[PDB]
Design a protein around this ligand. Structure first.
Ligand SMILES: Nc1ncnc2c1ncn2[C@@H]1O[C@H](CSCC[C@H](N)C(=O)O)[C@@H](O)[C@H]1O
Ligand SMILES: Nc1ncnc2c1ncn2[C@@H]1O[C@H](CSCC[C@H](N)C(=O)O)[C@@H](O)[C@H]1O
Ligand code: SF4
Ligand code: SF4
Ligand code: SF4
Ligand code: SF4
Lengths: 322, 323
């Protein structure tokens, strides 16, 4: 039906860049002193709109650390509750230190339709959160089979989290664990040696270079991104045109965005072939090797000059097709 | 204009054979190269043809045994499904990863035959039968096929937690969903593993946490049809086959009209446990106080015709009160 929009069923909101941790890989460079965030009242309005929206099924919350201002998170989950939307959360699990706190939060999550909780723990998070805190959360989650539990571990060649998993003991039984490489963005750009980042892809294997898929995120910088990959936040791709924009308008802009249409239909080779034919790979600092497809994305579109360079080619594509 | 009809009709699993190249000490099926339990090949072709033609089934899953052992047969079944465009899932011990030719050829076939998920099982129990490098070859090659969801399932006990297994896989596990899970004490796990080494972190006190993970129809290699994928269901007297040539529509109808399973789903295990507790039947029914999974309660509640029949008057009362 031309505009079918298979992106209006989920939305993510990044509540704050503030975090109790200061992870050396952090794509947001989050820390207790981070000040980037949308205003609380503005977030209440966004959440109220997402709860009332008839197509949205799932609302996800991320940061930063969303459990740091738990009173506000619970307040937003209560706005959604009469509308019966599903909620997902991601956390560093610092709150797991008290088993009593873990029991209160799980009681709330279960009564507020939280269907998934992802806990991030690895050698990068370890200086900030104790292993026992993660174990308390993972162990208590067994009492709530309707909450899908995941453990996400960000790794490098020198920090593969092998001993982290062992210290977690049997608390990880039944938990989906995913170890993933670093995206070279934020604190990972300056605090991690590039040689320690796993390189799985190169500029020549163009057949594997396809975006995994779009998902709308209202970010703590006040912008709107087409996915939640750490790489996207340093790009200049935004779906925001004004302060008070509806989700119908955000979805319409995502579906009519020519760059994103070309990226989805043609893959990253359409853009890489333009830079290669114009001898711009070195001028635009495209890395030869990357840890993920998102690494190409971030390097192609992380400046106004780099994005604008494609505009005459996109205009030609629009005229040729359609 | 039609409210919700039958549930559990969007997926089906078929267990192709109990034969396997491995002889894992935990195996719920007691699979080995000498296992003879299996439905006939032609009978399976008919089942797969019916599932492919079926209007509601979206996903067809294959398991064993080791389904890649008789690759020619598996590929034939996947080819029957192909014109109907159903999604397929596979689970394997990955013994075929030792051969680079098999890895390339099998991934090409899976991608062209709409295989959306492949689960590889590797742990200390599988390790004597399949080399680590074989698993590594499969995981590494899977990166070239991003539309195939890859999972690593590791069966563990207190004495065999598979800690070194993960380390020796290196970075081939990056992006792979790993799940370590405890044992269900069925099959070879009943006699070859000490009960003390099986994790038992679920209890009866977690009454509100006692819910069945969900029903999924399984056409098993013993020729029976089961309402779920748990190794524990085989020991219950809960089955879905009434005759040799039974349609999938009939299997679904039987599952949806099973009053015990309706009550179990809607009310949870506490409905049955509360009846036992009120009449002091927990010890008479050998209900364990601790268990590795909720399926452990299931197995103990319904493992005899007399236990199932004990609930009949209460379920009849429930049907009359509700509906
Ligand atoms: N440079 C980077 N590359 C890859 N993953 C990164 C990253 N920076 C952060 N992440 C991951 O992005 C996820 C969300 S971070 C925000 C949620 C919360 N503070 C948490 O840590 O879970 C975490 O799993 C984190 O490890
Ligand atoms: N007693 C038991 N308890 C729990 N999981 C078991 C089990 N016996 C077998 N399994 C698991 O059931 C799954 C399917 S076994 C059949 C598929 C294939 N041979 C394979 O090993 O993957 C495997 O992950 C296996 O480890
Ligand atoms: S990765 Fe998560 S826990 Fe670590 S600094 Fe970033 S926001 Fe905080
Ligand atoms: S390829 Fe680009 S748009 Fe697609 S998920 Fe990765 S960063 Fe986002
Ligand atoms: S667990 Fe899988 S690989 Fe091991 S014996 Fe059983 S069927 Fe074979
Ligand atoms: S609780 Fe019973 S019916 Fe449900 S999956 Fe486990 S064994 Fe099967």
């Amino acid at each position: 039906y031309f505009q079918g929009h298979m992106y209006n069923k989920t939305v993510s909101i990044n509540l704050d860049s503030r975090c109790n941790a200061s992870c050396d890989h952090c794509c947001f460079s989050s820390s207790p002193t981070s000040t980037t965030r949308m205003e609380k009242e503005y977030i209440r309005e966004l959440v109220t709109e997402f709860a009332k929206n008839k197509t949205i099924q799932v609302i996800s919350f991320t940061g930063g650390e969303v459990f740091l201002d738990y009173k506000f998170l619970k307040e937003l989950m209560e706005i959604i509750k009469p509308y019966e939307k599903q909620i997902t959360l991601i956390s560093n699990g610092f709150w797991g230190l008290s088993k009593k706190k873990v029991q209160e939060y799980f009681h709330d999550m279960n009564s507020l339709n939280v269907i998934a909780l992802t806990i991030s723990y690895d050698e990068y998070h370890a200086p900030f959160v104790k292993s026992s805190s993660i174990k308390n959360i993972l162990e208590h989650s067994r009492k709530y089979p309707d909450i899908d539990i995941s453990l996400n571990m960000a790794v490098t060649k020198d920090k593969m989290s092998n001993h982290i998993l062992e210290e977690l003991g049997d608390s990880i039984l039944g938990v989906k664990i995913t170890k993933f490489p670093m995206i070279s963005v934020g604190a990972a750009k300056t605090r991690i040696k590039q040689e320690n980042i796993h390189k799985f892809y190169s500029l020549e294997d163009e057949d594997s270079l396809h975006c995994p898929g779009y998902a709308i995120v209202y970010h703590h910088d006040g912008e709107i991104y087409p996915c939640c990959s750490p790489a996207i936040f340093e790009t200049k791709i935004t779906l925001r045109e004004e302060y008070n924009q509806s989700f119908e308008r955000t979805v319409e802009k995502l579906n009519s965005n020519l760059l994103l249409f070309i990226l989805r239909k043609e893959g990253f080779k359409w853009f890489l072939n333009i830079l290669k034919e114009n001898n711009k790979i070195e001028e635009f600092d495209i890395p030869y090797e990357f840890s993920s497809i998102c690494g190409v994305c971030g390097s192609l579109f992380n400046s106004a000059e780099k994005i604008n360079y494609f505009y005459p080619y996109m205009e030609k594509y629009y005229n040729e097709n359609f």
